[PDB]
DNA sequence: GTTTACACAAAAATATTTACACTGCCCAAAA
DNA sequence: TTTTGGGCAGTGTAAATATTTTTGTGTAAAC
């Protein structure tokens, strides 16, 4: 895609800005942009005004130019200076690079993904200023990646799908600048499969979890746009949320969240050397009907009742939350058990917010938690395997669905 | 000012004509895809002009940029994407080796540069080796020599390479130390085993200084758990603020008595070099803390494992060299900043050692 | 006679700096 | 022995803060 045009161009600017190297080929470079932007604005001048320099009117010129005035601007190849012409009244106005604008490079976006990315406002900082030329500061960033917020407030407001076969909640604490006291919140995040199989971040939500009904609140923003039933949710059992669904969404049928019961459980205080007991804790979601899980697990507390006492014990006390996983189907089972569905997503948030130990108010949170969310579900593309069982599954287990 | 030309002002018209140009972006744009391969050959005709100091090649703007990247860590890939994203044209990871070897000139004369005659205070530290691939693989070890001199500046001295613990390779060093401009050396703290006794007393040998407390620690918690190492930390934060040297002996029996059963052969050879470690309790309190710091050895450390993760892909018998003084004039920028309360310390010093 | 360039300030838009209010993370240590 | 404090090193960004650009208008030079 080489036009013999484009030859004569390069060969003609070679020949008048004399390029002999490649150091004189980027200054050239930079002299070019400069004096291609400052004829276009003298030629949008000439249109404002209506005649070129130094020619007479029939009509008395209602306003004559009065000469120039400097202009640094920061482009993607370096820093470059121009000379702007002006009108007397200062009525003429710039197309290519509006007033006051001095960051005419798109660098915009590209910074919002490097923050996305987890990079710090001052990392951000020194590598443009690295590999780029010009500064660009800290709150500089903060106030570009501020840009995205009627976008978050839009994505809070989301339209949803109407039946969700699927859902998930996870909950991830950091700290946050409150009333000028720094205290703790846990932000809470609704993943759910659609009918087509596809997983899709629908919710995020700030915590606050000192009264019940804030957990009760978000289901009823999904009473605002998910108006359809859950076939199954997983949500680690935690603040009374069994009478917030029950009273919002009863026909839900609730189970408890297996991987969150091994992440909370078995795994919160366990010998780090000898972790790999799974194995067998697979042999109790890999039995055919509930009553043989039930003796597994006795098995495996058995087995476990030489160490620390307390792991099985949940087991036992949640086992009537936990019984519903056995009436699903293998392929059904699989959806439940795959901790990598759901820490991929934790331990994604904990390498991304690995730098960003305490964020100043709500909305900084909020920020980051959208940007990383958006950076996670960019490639949540694939659906998910061997579906369409699953949905016939599914509705012959819920026959209305 | 810039007067253009009328033959530019048709060159500038014919640019807009062809690329369409109706905003700034869509003139960046045109300038990349019109530029790009023409930039490409450029530079590696420029770079391939030996075969295709005394003569040091001159530096292009996105040469030093390349190099700033390569300083940062960043994988081929991501270099490649950001000079397509800004020039417009693809470079390969021998092209960026072909742009890194550059740098070596400035190599040559940072390891060449005058020195001053007497350092105070001199540490040379050892770190992991990406070993360099000539048709061998080593045992051998990187050594950085970092002192500070009769003000407060800390600067990195010498970056060496050898056979670890023969004696000649510690006799080399302090042969280029010398040859530097170097004449004596106060204190010097070197990692403790063979050669470096012979070295001292055939290299620097004013006095006798086998003063090395940073480099035991190190090589008796090394061969322990990091979550047991918070307990020999406060156990060794007990053994090092002993006000008199017998005090430490003491807390050195103490912690040996208590960790020499879950981990024996450690402390036994502390005790051994314990003959070597009794003077640095002569120094004051104020050149013990500048001695035990070890602050600028875990940024140091910090960057070269930032290097060793990302950088560690071409042969190292250049790339190494260069990752390595590219850590260390990123630490050295900005680490021009004098040292706290330096003045007692050299009052200290020159009384210590009174004939200087 | 006109037209534009240039040079001073003052206003306005923008981007840098300071200041949090902490979190981690080492120690120098007391009860 | 475990719990305090005390620097240091980070963070995102509100609020003073400095900087750069644009403008008002008066001249000096140019067509």
Redesign the interface.
Known sequence: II?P??KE??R??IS?YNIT???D??EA?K??????????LEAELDEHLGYEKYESTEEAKSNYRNGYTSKTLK????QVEI?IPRDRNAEFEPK??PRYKRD???IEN?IIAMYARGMSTREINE?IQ????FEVSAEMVSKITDKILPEIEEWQKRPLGEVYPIVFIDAIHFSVKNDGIVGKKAVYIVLAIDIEGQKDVIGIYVGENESSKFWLSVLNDLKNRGVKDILILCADALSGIKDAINAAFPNTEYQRCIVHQIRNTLKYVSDKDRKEFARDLKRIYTAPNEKAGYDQMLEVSEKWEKKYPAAMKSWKSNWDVICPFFKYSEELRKIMYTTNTIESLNSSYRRINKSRTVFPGDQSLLKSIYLATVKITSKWTMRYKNWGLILGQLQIMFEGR
């Not at 482009?75 to 370096?78: D, I, L």
């Open positions: 036009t045009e484009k161009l390069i003609n600017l008048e190297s490649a150091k080929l980027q470079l002299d070019l942009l400069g004096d291609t932007i400052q004829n276009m482009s993607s190849v370096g000379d290519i690079v005419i490079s798109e590209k590598q690295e590999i780029y030329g």
